[PDB]
Paper text:
[name] activity drives malignant phenotypes in hematologic and solid cancers including breast, prostate, lung, colorectal, and pancreatic cancer. Engineering selectivity into [name] inhibitors is challenging because of the high degree of sequence homology between [name] family members and other receptor tyrosine kinases. Here, we present formal biochemical, biophysical, and structural characterization of [name] inhibition by [name]-06-116.
[name]-06-116 was easily modeled into the predicted binding site for all, with the warhead forming continuous electron density with Cys-280. As expected, the nitrogen of [name]-06-116′s carboxamide linker hydrogen bonds to gatekeeper Thr-338. The nitrogen is also part of a coordinated hydrogen bonding network that includes an active-site water (HOH432), catalytic Lys-298, the backbone of Cys-280, and the carbonyl [name]-06-116. The chloro-methyl phenyl substituent is situated in the back pocket of the [name] kinase, creating hydrophobic interactions with Ile-297 and Leu-396. Altogether, our interpretation of these findings is that a strong reversible interaction is required to allow sufficient time for the p-loop to sample a kinked conformation compatible with covalent bond formation.
Numbering used by the authors: 261 to 414, 425 to 536
Write the structure that this text describes.
């Protein structure tokens, strides 16, 4: 309906891997436009709930969110979006290009993510699965938010990324996305290391409820660590908005750290 395209117009060329809720390919639409195609494996806990992500992606349109191109609603179900040339941000940070990424690039990538989540904030949506694994990198270090299957109006809650009030009581708000953003900032500043090193899930929930927070990563400024701790307030109402986070991260090297100097890793 309005978005559906003939199956013959697509050509699945190179397989990219098993992405979020489905198998992702690098294809070509109408022999002219390079695209990305997610396929549903039949029977795997999804009839048209696989199409629930494309249902949300039709309403949410923003330059920092992966844009929906088309959809094939007859099995096998295809979801066609734009192609992000660099892949997952987590793989990008762990990968070859991650070595040379310094704080200026990593803060800008975060500002792009805060800008995308600021649009989600204005649209009264909640992401519920914000992390480096669900953010795609394109050309010129363009970062875009992905995985809108759990997105709703106002991989189930990994404890290390989810706000404790959302993991425990199901209170998923935009402030629980700000908590996840603070965790993502540790992924950026640590070249994509898993948060809370050496701790299992139930140990993270007990420690975080006792007030434990991850310390300042090495070579990370205290000002950026303070922004993480604000994203990790126990009370969600006192956690910053994404409009503030975006404006903060864009002006970071003028208004916050004008005497920044590059180090070994950051
Ligand atoms: C949750 C987002 C997701 O699934 N990300 C992901 C992870 C692994 C493979 C594919 C995708 N999705 C995806 N990728 C790309 N582009 C892309 C993927 C992988 C690479 N590689 C380079 C590094 N090396 C390790 C091999 C892998 C390069 C580029 N573009 C789009 C998407 C994507 O998920 N698009 C999308 C579709 C098709 C449907 C619905 C939503 C989205 Cl975001």
């Amino acid at each position: 309906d309005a978005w559906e395209i003939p199956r013959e117009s697509l050509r699945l060329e190179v397989k990219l891997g098993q992405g979020c809720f489905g198998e992702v390919w690098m294809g070509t639409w109408n022999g002219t436009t390079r695209v990305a195609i997610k396929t549903l494996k039949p029977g795997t806990m999804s009839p048209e709930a696989f199409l629930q992500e494309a249902q949300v992606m039709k309403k949410l349109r923003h330059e920092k969110l992966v844009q929906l191109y088309a959809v094939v609603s007859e099995e096998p179900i295809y979801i066609v979006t734009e192609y992000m040339s660099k892949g997952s941000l987590l793989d990008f940070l762990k990968g070859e290009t991650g070595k040379y990424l310094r704080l200026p690039q990593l803060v800008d990538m975060a500002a792009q993510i805060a800008s995308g989540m600021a649009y989600v904030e204005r649209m009264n949506y909640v992401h519920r699965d914000l992390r480096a694994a669900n953010i795609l990198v394109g050309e010129n270090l363009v970062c875009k938010v992905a995985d809108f299957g759990l997105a709703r109006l106002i991989a189930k809650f990994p404890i290390k990324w989810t706000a404790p009030e959302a993991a425990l009581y199901g209170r998923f708000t935009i402030k629980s996305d700000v908590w996840s953003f603070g965790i993502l900032l540790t992924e950026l500043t640590t070249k994509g290391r898993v948060p809370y090193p050496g701790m299992v899930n139930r140990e993270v929930l007990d420690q975080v409820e006792r007030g434990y927070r991850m310390p300042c990563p090495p070579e990370c400024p205290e000002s950026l660590h303070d922004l993480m701790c604000q994203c990790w307030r126990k009370e969600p109402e006192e956690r910053p908005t994404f409009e503030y986070l975006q404006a903060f991260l864009e002006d970071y090297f003028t208004s916050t750290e004008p005497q920044y100097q590059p180090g070994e890793n950051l």
